[PDB]
Design a protein around this ligand. Sequence first.
Ligand SMILES: *[C@@H]1O[C@H](CO)[C@@H](O)[C@H](O)[C@H]1NC(C)=O
Ligand SMILES: *[C@@H]1O[C@H](CO)[C@@H](O)[C@H](O)[C@H]1NC(C)=O
Ligand SMILES: *[C@@H]1O[C@H](CO)[C@@H](O)[C@H](O)[C@H]1NC(C)=O
Ligand SMILES: *[C@@H]1O[C@H](CO)[C@@H](O)[C@H](O)[C@H]1NC(C)=O
Ligand SMILES: *[C@@H]1O[C@H](CO)[C@@H](O)[C@H](O)[C@H]1NC(C)=O
Ligand SMILES: *[C@@H]1O[C@H](CO)[C@@H](O)[C@H](O)[C@H]1NC(C)=O
Lengths: 486, 486, 486
Amino acid sequence: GNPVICMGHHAVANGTMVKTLADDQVEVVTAQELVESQNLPELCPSPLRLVDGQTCDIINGALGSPGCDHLNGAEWDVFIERPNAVDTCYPFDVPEYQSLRSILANNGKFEFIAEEFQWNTVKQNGKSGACKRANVNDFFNRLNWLVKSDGNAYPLQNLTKINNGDYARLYIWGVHHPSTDTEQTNLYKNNPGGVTVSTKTSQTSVVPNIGSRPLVRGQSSRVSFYWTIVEPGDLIVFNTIGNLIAPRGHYKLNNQKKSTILNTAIPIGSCVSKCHTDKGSLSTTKPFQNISRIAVGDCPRYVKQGSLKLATGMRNIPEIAGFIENGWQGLIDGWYGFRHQNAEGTGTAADLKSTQAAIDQINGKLNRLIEKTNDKYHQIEKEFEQVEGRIQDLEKYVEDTKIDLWSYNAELLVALENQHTIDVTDSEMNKLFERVRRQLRENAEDKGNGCFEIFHKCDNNCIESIRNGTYDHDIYRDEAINNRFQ
Amino acid sequence: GNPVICMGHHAVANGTMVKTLADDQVEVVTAQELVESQNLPELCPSPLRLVDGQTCDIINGALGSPGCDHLNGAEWDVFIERPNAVDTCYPFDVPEYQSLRSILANNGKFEFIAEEFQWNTVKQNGKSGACKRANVNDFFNRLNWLVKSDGNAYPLQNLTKINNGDYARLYIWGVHHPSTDTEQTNLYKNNPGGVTVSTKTSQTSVVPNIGSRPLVRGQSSRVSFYWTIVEPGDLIVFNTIGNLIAPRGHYKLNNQKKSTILNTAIPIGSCVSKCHTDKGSLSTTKPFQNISRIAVGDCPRYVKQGSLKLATGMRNIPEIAGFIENGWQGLIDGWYGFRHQNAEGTGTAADLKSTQAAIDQINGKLNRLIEKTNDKYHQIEKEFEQVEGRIQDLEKYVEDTKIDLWSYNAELLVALENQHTIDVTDSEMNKLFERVRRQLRENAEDKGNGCFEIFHKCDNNCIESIRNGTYDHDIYRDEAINNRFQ
Amino acid sequence: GNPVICMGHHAVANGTMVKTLADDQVEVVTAQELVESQNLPELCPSPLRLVDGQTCDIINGALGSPGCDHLNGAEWDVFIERPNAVDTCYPFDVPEYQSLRSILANNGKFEFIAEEFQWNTVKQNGKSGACKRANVNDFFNRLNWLVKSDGNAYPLQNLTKINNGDYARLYIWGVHHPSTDTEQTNLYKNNPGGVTVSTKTSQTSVVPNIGSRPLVRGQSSRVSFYWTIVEPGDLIVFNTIGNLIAPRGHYKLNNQKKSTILNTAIPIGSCVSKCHTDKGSLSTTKPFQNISRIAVGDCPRYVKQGSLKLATGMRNIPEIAGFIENGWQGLIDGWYGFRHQNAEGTGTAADLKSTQAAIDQINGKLNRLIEKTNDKYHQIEKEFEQVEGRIQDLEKYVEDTKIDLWSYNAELLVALENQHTIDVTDSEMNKLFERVRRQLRENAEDKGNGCFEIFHKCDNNCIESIRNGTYDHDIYRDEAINNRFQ
Ligand SMILES: *[C@@H]1O[C@H](CO)[C@@H](O)[C@H](O)[C@H]1NC(C)=O
Ligand SMILES: *[C@@H]1O[C@H](CO)[C@@H](O)[C@H](O)[C@H]1NC(C)=O
Ligand SMILES: *[C@@H]1O[C@H](CO)[C@@H](O)[C@H](O)[C@H]1NC(C)=O
Ligand SMILES: *[C@@H]1O[C@H](CO)[C@@H](O)[C@H](O)[C@H]1NC(C)=O
Ligand SMILES: *[C@@H]1O[C@H](CO)[C@@H](O)[C@H](O)[C@H]1NC(C)=O
Ligand SMILES: *[C@@H]1O[C@H](CO)[C@@H](O)[C@H](O)[C@H]1NC(C)=O
């Protein structure tokens, strides 16, 4: 009625507050941050293929403006478009600009196929002071500025290109908008001009608009650019009586389009990462991130929270007594264990089976919190210089809606996991106590503080018999029953 | 101190692995597949109304092209549009094609109301070899091709129709685009022609475009189709000085539009199902499916996972002794039960109350997990032939976002439910053991293996008294206390 | 061997049914409603700034139609647009109506900056009987109707305005569409007219459409309105040969645009609320609401459910006897407690620390069950007069998708929380019973009904001694041991 065996668990000086369904804050021994809030100050050039547009945005790249030559033949997973990109060529606009930019970016290559267009009588290769290369008048190198002949002729043009190849063709073409009637006739004889470009099942017809626009690189006139996709088995017809800015060929479209574009001033570095934001690449295994909604590649999901801590250990209670409202700061080789008091003295030993059982159920969630990949490339635009109305409203609402739902998911997930982690570790403690209870049977009594009073002589070999489960109560039953009740 | 009663639970040789918050794989006695991964090879024409466009897509159906007669008067919940649909009439285009298609599909019927249009002087009922009907030159039968009089006159047209009914009217009309100036005047005298169609609050004006398009069904010319909706209390005015393809009347719009369209080659069968995918109908009560994101009617939610298994039973531990050990493959008449060994021999019996408690908390899930039915009809397009740019990017991103969120919900739901199912069945096992402990009082001791050693003689009818809760402990107390401590 | 101490919990005659993972309906002692299903019959003008359009919708307010002067200088968080608003001025349309309406509403102010436009030779300030102001012919007061000179001339207009300020400018301008060729030349001499408005990087060109349209306020002619945003450092050029409806200046755009518009007939009251629906303001702290998907401000999230009940107490079991059989309606000053029977009689007192522990885990739940915000202003349109096709389909699908996901989140959240609530309160009952058992040691036996049979003389400050944890077991031990076993 003297030796005592106590059951307990580890503890630390002070651990980490986490969140459960019950408490807003519970202290636990260990925990892990689930939100990545650090980013690299650069973009990683591998394993994804990045192409730097440099001074050239992707639209000026497709057109072949001065300064964009480095993009001829380029192929990318991610086109890196620079906010300080500048226009170097004839002033132009693109109706549905954003859609052409999307298509070009998503296609993922600039593979241009020259074609001979046998324009009739008109002069070709018109060039401009608004589009110099090294101070020589020039023009977009994928386009061909047609003007009237020396004999003051611009006949109806009528050229067909048939696609019997195995890829869809992208043709980019334009309409010139002069500033005066005199400019219109000086360039194209006819007034008005006009352009119709058609396939079997679609058509674009454009009438030029004559008028003064703001001066840009000395020019008040403009080009408007259009595009036409021609599928295998289809064909394209160019018709004009003036003002056509003609293609010199077509771009090849990939059947599968899986690339995208990222607009950012962040330099390309030397690191390795498959996740890129507009702030730079992330190098992380965390499931969430609060760095930017703009994220391309294999990325954590964007959430609003700055921090979410996942418990990776039991409730922490610091400070002859077992578990019951003390933890053992001295237990450092296990999660649970035995502390005893007999004739030879005292000792503390870790229990492996319960310790492993807790770890398995808690490092059970550490394999599946980290497995779904979220590998995403072409998405939607998510920031905007100026308001546009209905479509931008929807783009913004869709993204806001998505972020709020994932933020909620993240919040709920961690609270649920932590509640489960606490319940599991509390349960494993109780299971250890109950295991010992069953071993002792009638040879001991519950002291109420997580300890058993053992009513018989129990030396260190006997204590160990309890700890390793070889203790036979029958050996000590007579001795114990007699000491208990008399 | 000799008879024994043991508390246990059933088990089987081959269990099923499921997922919880803890383990990737916990074996349980029974489980249920929550993802439908099988489909029917056909579409079921009951209980929803399916209309098969056959060779006629819905736009050609509305126009009245040859081969679309079967659609006259049709009404549908789902219009089945065929990928092998073919054009059978004059080559045409529709600005905002996708939106007219959506409106026609969503409306759910072709109820055409003919109207007398008193066109002045111009000839009516133009026909074409490009649109033959039973080997005779003809035209879209909802449209009226107006051309100049024999006297070479096409006067300014000016007709009004007032909507004094109680439904909104859909008028479909077109503009013919000639290939040459000669054609333009041959047909319409004037050059240019022109069309304006207006109501009180809206207007559409179209100028014909003249030029060479690719030859289709013998024609380089084209018709462009437009539409105008006329609400009750409004009215429509048609003016033209040439090139008008006039309506013969209007379609009735339903006030409530709740139908849709499914593009698929899958045959319509003879089966019964309210859930249709582009791969065929589903016949299922599962809450999720991985067959296709394109799903109309009363359908499981589309998810990325191929399988999600819901535990419908307790942990499975194969291989007298109690539950601490293992389960009892011999217990086939309940979930929990008693196994005993006395002077008369052994035996195994089920406990109904514990079994039924567990089942109530599990099949309960099984009813509120196939929850409410996700009845959806007109949604958005989810497959595309070729990239379009901004709007298509958003449609794809919206769907991808939705699918990832539901896939996440499905994953978490099954793990949460499975964790609860295991917790409940574990709990019910313990409550049975604790029930029996309180019956036995001081007349028995815990053997540690889920069994009680009963310290008095206990025959098959004393055992039954324990199993059905009539055992009075005071009857045996003295004999038991005696055998225990002396 | 006959005093008894019982452990129990409270109960009530009438409780509330809630839903868990396990049960379709568990009755609990207390619960709360999480779905707000009541609204105020008015809009609260505090603390958000509401501006009532009254008879003017926001487009007519921007144009400066008669009756809209009250909106000059207005600033709003939410513009309240009335469905019975009426047109008071020249019949007009706006090609991208919804996008101008969005930009105006989102910008959040009408701050017009007048500019002098030195139009050349043309007459200014055209007025109309269709736009009377105080019963004299007038016009939109932000616009300037230019017509030909008395010399019968309309020379090319070519005016430039430079944005050298620090805010973006919104210019609203129009194009007049006459009804006959005679009207065209009567008003503008030239036929056709024409308008081009451009900046450095954008342009809009419009050809007027001539033709008969339904008479609206005596007019068959129309105006189409367009807009042009001019960033600081940019400039705008107006160029026309007739039919231009000229701006009188520009609206100031905020850099940060965070306001919105709510279309509703609901009157503005005198209450206080930061949540507004089209049905009226809400005054609630619930997390969810089923009143309307249209909700602006700091609002509960819209869900499909009419009711979701969150358990705020333990299970209700209504009706010597401990917690096993049932709870105690008589216990009205705590959640858990002791009931005894002595020599000196019977008695009930509540246990503090058990009651508190349960409340901390449950009150804890709902101060951050309703937590964050849902602070949303400019969103998307969610109700539509008539079908439009592709964009409207996507808007509706996006909102439907959102609502289903939040409705699922709410359902799961309440089921999970309620399960945890019931588990916690069951747990604390058991912890209480085990606390006492650990005190009594060998001086009592578990009667099986949540009570202990104490095997010794125990007076009322022996009973009290147990309740405040002072009870020393070895004081009575051998008295007890003796009546237990002999
Ligand atoms: C030129 O146009 C005519 C129709 O007027 C067409 O038949 C012919 O194929 C066209 N030629 C080319 C080279 O496109
Ligand atoms: C992301 O979280 C960190 C804290 O982890 C915070 O300092 C930072 O401001 C956050 N980023 C935001 C709010 O954009
Ligand atoms: C024809 O036009 C005149 C004026 O242009 C108009 O008064 C009349 O209502 C029009 N008739 C119809 C049937 O629209
Ligand atoms: C759907 O799931 C099954 C497994 O149940 C899988 O075999 C099939 O390929 C899946 N369908 C897909 C991935 O399209
Ligand atoms: C008018 O047009 C001329 C050229 O046509 C241009 O140089 C001038 O800047 C324009 N003036 C204004 C005020 O826009
Ligand atoms: C909202 O819920 C209440 C019940 O709480 C119900 O009576 C009301 O009809 C609901 N509103 C709807 C369905 O629009």
